[PDB]
């Protein structure tokens, strides 16, 4: 953000004949994640559903993003 925001630069030849670059920047913030559990009490053999709202975990806009459990 601020001075470190990603910026694209384009060197340019102006109508006054002098070379003057043009540029734009956009900030790339990070997001605070929350995790929640759908119910406050469960019983044996109840479905428990876990949701994580972290925008930073989306790494591709075309594909569904999946995270899996480790068995090693």
């Amino acid at each position: 953000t601020d001075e470190d925001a990603p910026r694209v630069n384009y060197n340019d030849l102006g109508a006054d004949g002098v070379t003057t670059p043009v540029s734009d920047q956009e900030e790339a913030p990070s997001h605070s994640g929350v995790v929640s559990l759908n119910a406050d009490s469960y019983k044996i053999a109840d479905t428990v559903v876990i949701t994580v709202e972290d925008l930073d975990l989306n790494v591709d806009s075309d594909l569904i993003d999946i995270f899996t459990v480790v068995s090693d």
Binding site: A15, D16, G17, V18
Partner: protein, 145 residues
């Protein structure tokens, strides 16, 4: 560099007449002095140090040494509009003309900042409303922060 109409909008072909110089149509000045590049035979003055004004400008990365070097032209907006437009960009440094009465001009030995100097443009109408020669102009100020 061999004609009185140097670094001005007009023609290399020229004559000396009563009203002034016949080949001059428009020029640009800083502090009421022609904005011209230090070239020719009379640009050997070094000023305070041993560096001539021409190389003195080059070390500052300036390529807009005068009006002729910016590529300034007057272009008619339409085929028959009768309105002419040109543009250029103000430089950080310029080289003053010491004596305008010699051809080529004699240039100073040290570059000067353009900040705090007025800028003017002068147009010479060969035919005014009565068909007589007159010169007209506009002025503005270069500032710094």
């Amino acid at each position: 560099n061999s004609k009185a109409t140097d670094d001005a909008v007009g023609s290399a072909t020229t004559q000396s007449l009563s009203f002034g110089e016949l080949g001059r149509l428009l020029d640009v000045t800083f502090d009421d002095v022609i904005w011209s590049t230090p070239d020719g035979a009379n640009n050997t003055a070094t000023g305070n140090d041993s560096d001539t004004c021409s190389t003195e400008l080059s070390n500052a990365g300036i390529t807009d040494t005068g009006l002729g070097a910016t590529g300034f032209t007057l272009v008619e907006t339409g085929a028959a509009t009768g309105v002419f437009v040109g543009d250029f960009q103000i430089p950080s440094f310029w080289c003053r003309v010491s004596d305008t009465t010699t051809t080529p001009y004699t240039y100073a030995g040290d570059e000067e900042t353009t900040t705090g100097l007025d800028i003017e443009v002068n147009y010479v109408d060969f035919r005014d409303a009565s068909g007589e020669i007159v010169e007209v102009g506009d002025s503005a100020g270069v500032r710094a922060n």
